[PDB]
């Protein structure tokens, strides 16, 4: 559970020296880019219901055998555990957007998830598909290009940060497969 600060400090601790100029310079760029990351996490957190709803409903509509009897989602409870899992995945992604390093997401939720879903019977492909829909919708909300919510912020460039969020989602989707 380490962000960008802890990463620089631990690497400079194994190197065994003082923090130094270059490391501090890159970390200055992080803090100067701070408020964009703030507003970004605000966007993904204040669209949690839509992101989870649309994502899992799109997972069902793409592959309609999940809802057919015998699928993972056929049981009513199964659908509730399905929605919970989508919500939790979105939640740790939002934590990795704050921290700037994926240490929280890797050590918490990504570790052993594949073998859990294997052991329970969950199809990996459907989940990978749901994570990809959360990716596209979440980057569309983080770039204010959502097709039904257009909030006002001052205009600027946040391509870097979009690539960052897409890197966390690709980490999850590659982690379940």
């Amino acid at each position: 559970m380490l962000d960008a600060f802890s990463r620089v400090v631990v690497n400079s601790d194994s190197k065994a020296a003082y923090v130094g100029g270059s490391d501090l310079q890159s970390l200055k760029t992080f803090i100067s880019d701070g408020n964009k990351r703030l507003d970004a996490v605000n966007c993904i957190v204040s669209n949690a219901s839509c992101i989870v709803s649309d994502a899992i409903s799109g997972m069902i509509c793409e592959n309609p055998g999940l809802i057919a009897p015998g699928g993972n989602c056929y049981t009513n409870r199964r659908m509730a555990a399905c929605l919970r899992d989508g919500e939790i995945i979105l939640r740790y992604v939002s934590y990795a957007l704050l921290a700037g390093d994926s240490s929280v997401l890797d050590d918490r939720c990504l570790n052993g998830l594949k073998e859990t879903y294997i052991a329970l019977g969950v199809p990996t492909a459907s989940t990978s598909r749901a994570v990809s829909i959360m990716k596209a919708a979440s980057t569309a909300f983080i770039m204010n290009t959502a097709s039904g919510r257009k909030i006002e912020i001052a205009a600027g460039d946040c391509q870097a940060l979009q690539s960052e969020a897409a890197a966390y989602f690709d980490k999850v989707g590659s982690a379940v497969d």
């Binding site: 709803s53 409903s57 049981t75 009513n76 409870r77 659908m79 509730a80």
Partner: protein
């Protein structure tokens, strides 16, 4: 999956005893009320089609705002999901009616429903409109036996009181 025999076997199992005469009296009552339950199951498997058809038709006869816009169903697909969900419900009423406890109806239909109806913007009052139409529709001593009618009404009431 709760039934008479699973409650008593699970209860004596939690005790740590072999099954005494008490469990035997319980399963004796199972095989007493059995004929009325299975009669209701026979007639439900007889006309499930027309039951679900009258259920959904009366459900949109009450609430027309369902097709008003995004809320509820405004397309043929969503209405297909509507009649499919009522198919599932009557099928679980058939299953719990065979088992004779509310077990498969609870674990398959009721358990964790609230997150699903809540999250997917599904109003429960329209479900209740469907079931209260079918509850009223059956006529005492016009088709099934009077106790079978009681059995069916009881199970359907359980659905309603578990829904909202």
């Amino acid at each position: 999956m709760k039934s008479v025999i699973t409650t008593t076997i699970s209860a004596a199992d939690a005790a740590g005893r072999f099954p005494s005469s008490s469990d035997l009296e319980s399963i004796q009552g199972n095989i007493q009320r059995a004929s009325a339950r299975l009669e209701a199951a026979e007639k439900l498997s007889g006309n499930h089609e027309a039951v679900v058809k009258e259920a959904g038709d009366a459900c949109f006869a009450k609430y027309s705002y369902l097709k008003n816009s995004g809320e509820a169903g405004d397309s043929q697909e969503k209405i297909n999901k509507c009649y499919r969900d009522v198919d599932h419900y009557m099928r679980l009423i058939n299953y719990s009616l065979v088992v004779g406890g509310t077990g498969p109806l609870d674990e398959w239909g009721i358990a964790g429903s609230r997150e699903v109806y809540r999250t997917l913007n599904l109003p429960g009052s329209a479900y209740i409109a469907s079931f209260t139409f079918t509850r009223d529709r059956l006529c005492v001593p016009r088709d099934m036996s009077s106790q079978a009618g009681v059995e069916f009404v009881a199970a359907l009431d359980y659905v309603i009181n578990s829904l909202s």
